[PDB]
Design a protein around this ligand. Sequence first.
Ligand code: SF4
Ligand code: SF4
Ligand code: FES
Ligand code: FES
Ligand SMILES: [Fe+3]
Ligand SMILES: [Fe+3]
Lengths: 633, 633
Amino acid sequence: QNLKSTDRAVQQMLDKAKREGIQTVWDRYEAMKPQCGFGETGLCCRHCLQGPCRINPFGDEPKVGICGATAEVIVARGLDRSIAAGAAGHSGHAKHLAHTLKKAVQGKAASYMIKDRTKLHSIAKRLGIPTEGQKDEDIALEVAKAALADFHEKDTPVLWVTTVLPPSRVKVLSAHGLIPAGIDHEIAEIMHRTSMGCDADAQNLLLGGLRCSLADLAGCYMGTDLADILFGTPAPVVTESNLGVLKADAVNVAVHGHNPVLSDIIVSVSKEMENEARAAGATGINVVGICCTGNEVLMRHGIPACTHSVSQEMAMITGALDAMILDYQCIQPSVATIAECTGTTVITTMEMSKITGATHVNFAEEAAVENAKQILRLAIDTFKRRKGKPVEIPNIKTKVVAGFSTEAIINALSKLNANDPLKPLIDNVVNGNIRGVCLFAGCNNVKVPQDQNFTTIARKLLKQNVLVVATGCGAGALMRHGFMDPANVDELCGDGLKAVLTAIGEANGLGGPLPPVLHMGSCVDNSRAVALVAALANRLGVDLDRLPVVASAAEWMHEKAVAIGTWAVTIGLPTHIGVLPPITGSLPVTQILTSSVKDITGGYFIHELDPETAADKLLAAINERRAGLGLPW
Amino acid sequence: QNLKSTDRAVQQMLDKAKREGIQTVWDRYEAMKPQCGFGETGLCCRHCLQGPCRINPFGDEPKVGICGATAEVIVARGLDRSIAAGAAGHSGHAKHLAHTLKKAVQGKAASYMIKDRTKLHSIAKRLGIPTEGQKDEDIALEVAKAALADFHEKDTPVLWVTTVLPPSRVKVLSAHGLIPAGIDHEIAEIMHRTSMGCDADAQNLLLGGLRCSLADLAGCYMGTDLADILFGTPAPVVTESNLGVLKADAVNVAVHGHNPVLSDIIVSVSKEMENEARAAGATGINVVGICCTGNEVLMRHGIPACTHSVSQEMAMITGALDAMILDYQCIQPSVATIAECTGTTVITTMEMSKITGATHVNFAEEAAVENAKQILRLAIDTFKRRKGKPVEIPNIKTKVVAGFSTEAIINALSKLNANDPLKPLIDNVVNGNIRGVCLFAGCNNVKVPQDQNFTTIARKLLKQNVLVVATGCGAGALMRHGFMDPANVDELCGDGLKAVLTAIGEANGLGGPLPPVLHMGSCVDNSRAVALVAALANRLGVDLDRLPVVASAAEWMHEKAVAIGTWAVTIGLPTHIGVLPPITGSLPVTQILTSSVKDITGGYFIHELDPETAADKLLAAINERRAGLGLPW
Ligand code: SF4
Ligand code: SF4
Ligand code: FES
Ligand code: FES
Ligand SMILES: [Fe+3]
Ligand SMILES: [Fe+3]
C-alpha cells in the first residue's frame, strides 16, 4: 500500500477496500499495465477517420501519419488540444460565476450577493470601469459584462490577461502574437488548427498553444476575481485535513468538484438544518471538502479538507460518507459505482456533468437554497440508514492554517511595513533569508505514489530557505502531511525562512510563525500566485522571468494542469513537471518546451521524474535567477 | 491501382509516383496496417496524464478506464470532441468571412464589396434586421455584427440555427435542450464536459454532441450566406473536371483548402497578369481547383476542378503544377515534402495554418490584390524553371454542369410555375417521378477505393428515380465520373427522374436536361441543401423528418464531416455513413446513434460499409418516408 500512497489514512482504507473486494483507482491502473507506448510518447493521432495513425518512436514503419503528418506535428497537435480542453474547464467555471454575479445584481438569484465590495471596486478599476458615483450593483453588472465579453473577439484583447500581468510581460507577449483575442475564440481556433489538413508546423502550433494557455490564465484569474466578489476574499483560517475529519455520529457531507457557486450555499444552509439533523440522530451536519471546491470552502470558511484527487474514493470506503455533492472536473466516475457498496448518496447537480447511476438534483442559482435543502435532506436520510452500522474512519488528521489570498499576504506583510508591504519580502530575498519562491500546483497522479513528489521536493526547498506557496491538490498533499501546521516550522524550515515566517506571524498577533507552506487556494487560485509575483515584479521594476520564482506541477494529471503549466512557462517561470506529458516521441517538440521556449518567454519546462533531482533542478533555477539579479546564493 | 482509386487519371499518376519512388497517401496507409484496434473501435482515451487508457472490446482486463470511465463514456467523449473540432473548422471559416465583410463595408479592404445585394437583403430580413431606409453598407455591417454575435452567449440563441430550420423543427430541438447558445460557447462546453472527471453519462454526452453539431450547422449556413454576399450567389455554369484540365503550356495554379476569401481574389487577379505570364512563355494563367475552395470558385466562376481529397497529391505528380495556394483544412501536409520532387511551389497564406517547408505569404484582406500578385509571380517563376521538362498530364476530363445554389434551383423551377416554384418538384414527388432526394456529402477516405461508394450508390438511386444533390468531395467524386454531364442522363437516370430533369432544363433554355446530379457547392454549402429541404418542408407544412429525404457521407474522413453527419441526423434525416467512426466498441452508443436517436430527432445514422447494401438501405428509408405521407412507392 506504501507504493500506492504515502498517506497513512489512504493506506488504511486501501486495506479495507482490498478485503471488501472494492476496486480502486490503483487496481484499475494495475489492470491497464503495460500502457500503450504510442499514446504514452504522443505518437498517436485519431483526428480523422483514416486513422488511428501511430508512429514508431524508433525503428521502421510507420514513420509518418497517413496524411503526411510528422511526429512533431502529431505531438504538437495533441498537446494543443490538451491545453484547449484545460482552458475550456477554467473558462466554463469562470463563465458560470460571471452569469451568477449578473443574476445576483439583477435580482434573479437572491441567494447570492456582493459579499466583497472592496474587491469589486479594485477589479473595476483594474479594468478601467468607473466606480465614482455608481451603485455597487451597476459596477458589478459592468464587471460581469466585461467578464463575459472576454470570451469572444471585441475591440480589446482579453483584459483578464492584459490587465493582470506586468506591462513589460504584456509587451513581450504581444510581440510574439501570444495575447489571446477571446477565451472561447482561442479554444475554438486550437480545435480548428489541429484538425486534419490544417496547421502542420510544430513551432507555429506550439505558439498557438502558448496563446491558448493565456486564455486559460484569464479564466483562472476571472474565476478567482468573481468568486471573491460573490463569496469573500480569503483571510487566514485554521482547520484540519485528512479522513479523521469525518465523524461517525454526524451527517458527513462531502462537497466535491471545482465550482463553489453550489458548495458555498451548501455550507450556509447546512448550518440551518442541523436542527433537522439532530432529529435524525446525528450530532449535526459535518460538511467536508474534496478536491478544489473543498479548497474553496476551506479557504473561505474553514471547512475541513477530507481528501483529494487520486484518493477521493477512500472517503467513501470509511462507510461514514452519507452524501457526496458533485459539480464538475476531477470526479472519478467510479464514485457512482462504488456508492452501491458503501451506502453513500452520490449527487450530481450540473446539467453538463452527470454520472450514470448517481442521483441528479437540478441546481439553479435562482433556487439555490431549496436545492441545498433537498440535497441535505437526502444526506440526512442516508445517515439514518447506516445508524448501527460499523464505520472505519482512520483516526488521522493534521492541523491546517490556510486562507493566504494575495490580499491576506500583503496585509500580513503590511504589519512589518505599512506603506511598502512588499519591501520586507524583497528585503529578505535580497539578503538570503528567502532564497526564492516556489509554487506547487496541480493534481495527484496514479502513476506517482501519492504526495511523494510534493513532500520530497517541498522538504528540500524549505530547508534551503525557499518560500513555498501551494494550490489545488498540491496544497492538498502538503496540508495532509503537516506542511500547513506552524508547529512544524522548526522541523521543516531553514533558519532564514524560519526567521521570516516568525517575524510575520508574530507581527500578526499569533505568538507563532506563519505555517511552513502558504495555502493560496484552489486551482483557479493559481491566479493568486500570479497576482503576488506580478506585484513583486512591478515593485522591483523587472519582468517575471527575472524573479527567483519557479513552479512545480509535481504529480500533474488533468488537462487543466497542462494548461496551467503552459501559462506558467508563458509568463516566464521555470516550471517543473513530475509526469511526462505525451511529447517524448518528438525531440524537436521536447527541445522547444524544455529549452528554446526560453528565448520567447524566459520560462521553460523542467522535465524531471525523480523528486530529489527535481528539487536540485528547481534550486538551480532559483539560484540562476538570483545571479541574474546580482544577488548572493 | 484499381484497389486504390476508381479514377483512371488517379491510377495513371499512381503508376508514375510508384516508378519515381514518390510515397503517396496509399503507401502511407499501407505502412500503417494493421491499424490499432482500440482506436478503431473508440476504446482508447488520452484525456489525462494517467492514460493512455484502453478497453478490450471483448475478453478480460482492461475493462474500464483508470478513472472509472466506462466504454460508453469514453466512446461518447471521443465522438463529442470530433464534432466540436468539426464545428470549430466551419466556425472559423464563417468567422473569417464575417470579419471580411465588416472590413469591406468599413472601407478597410477595398478588394472586397457587397457583390450580391439581394442576398444581403434577404438575409437581413430572415434575421429581422431592418432594411427599409438603410444604406447597404449599414445593413451589411448589421449582418456582419449579427454573425459575430452568434459565436457567444447573448439574449437570443444562435440565429443561424433558429431562423434557418422549420419552426416545428426548432420547437422539437428546444424541447430537448438542443438549440446552441453560441457557436464557440458550445465548442468550449464540449471540451470541458469531455475532460477528465466531468460528464460521464453516455446519453447526456451525446445530447451535448447533437447540440454542438447544430453549432456546426450554424457555421456552415453563415459561411454560405456571407460568401454569397461577398462573392455572388452561384448560378448554373459549365466547366470541366479531373487532371486533364491542367495544360502543359500554361502556368497551372491550384487553389486548395476551404475559404474563398483568398482564392476568389486569385481568380480575379490571375486574369490581369496573363499578360505578365505570356512574357514568361505561358499561354496564360490556368487557375484550377482542389477540394472545397476549388468547389467555391467552380460554383461561382466555372474554374475547372482539378482533383479532390485523397488524390490531391496526384495533381503534383503530373509535373505541371507550378503553384498550389493553401488556406486551411484537408491539405495533406505531404504536399510540402512532395513538392521537393515535383517542382511545385506550395504556398500557405493563413497565420494558423502553416506547413514546414512550404513558402508562407502573409495574406490580409486589406492587401489582397498585392498578395495575389506576389503569389502568382512565384507561380510564373516556377513555370519558367520547368520549361523544356516533360510532363505527364493524363488526358482525362469530364464535362461538369454545376452552380445549383438553392436560389438557382428555385429559379429553375419557377419556369414551370412562377408563383409556386416548389410545387412542380412536390408534384413529381407525389406522383412517383421523383422517389425522393439524397444528398451526398463529405470527403474521400483512403480506407475506401476512391469514389467507389459515391458512384455505386448514386447509380442505383438515380435508376430508382431519386433526385441526387451533392457537395464537397462527394460532388467531386460524382463530377469526375460524369454524373454532372447532361449527356449522361439517358444512361444513368430512371424514366421518371429523366422526365423531370428534361422538363426543367428545356424550360430553362437548354434544349437538354439538367445534369444527373445537382452540384450544390462546397462543404459549408451543405447548408444550401438544408435551405432547400427546409423550404420543401414549409411548403408541405411538415417537419424534415417526414420528407422522403436522406443523406450519405459515403466515404467520410474529416471531423468536419462527422459534425455534418450529426447535424443531418439532428435535423431529422436518415444519414448513411460508409466508414465506421470509432463507436463500435460501445453497443449502447451505437444503438443510440443508429436507432433510439430516432425518438429524439426523427433522424438516425445508417452504418453500412457495402455500397450496394447502402443504396438498398437508403431506398428503404426513402420509401418508409413516402409511406408515412401515404404516397405510393
Ligand atoms: S489527421 Fe493524419 S495523422 Fe491524424 S488520423 Fe488523420 S490521417 Fe492519421
Ligand atoms: S480521463 Fe480516465 S479514461 Fe481517460 S486517460 Fe484519464 S484516467 Fe484514463
Ligand atoms: S495506438 Fe495506443 S494511444 Fe493510439
Ligand atoms: S491504444 Fe491505439 S488508439 Fe490508443
Ligand atoms: Fe482534485
Ligand atoms: Fe476535400
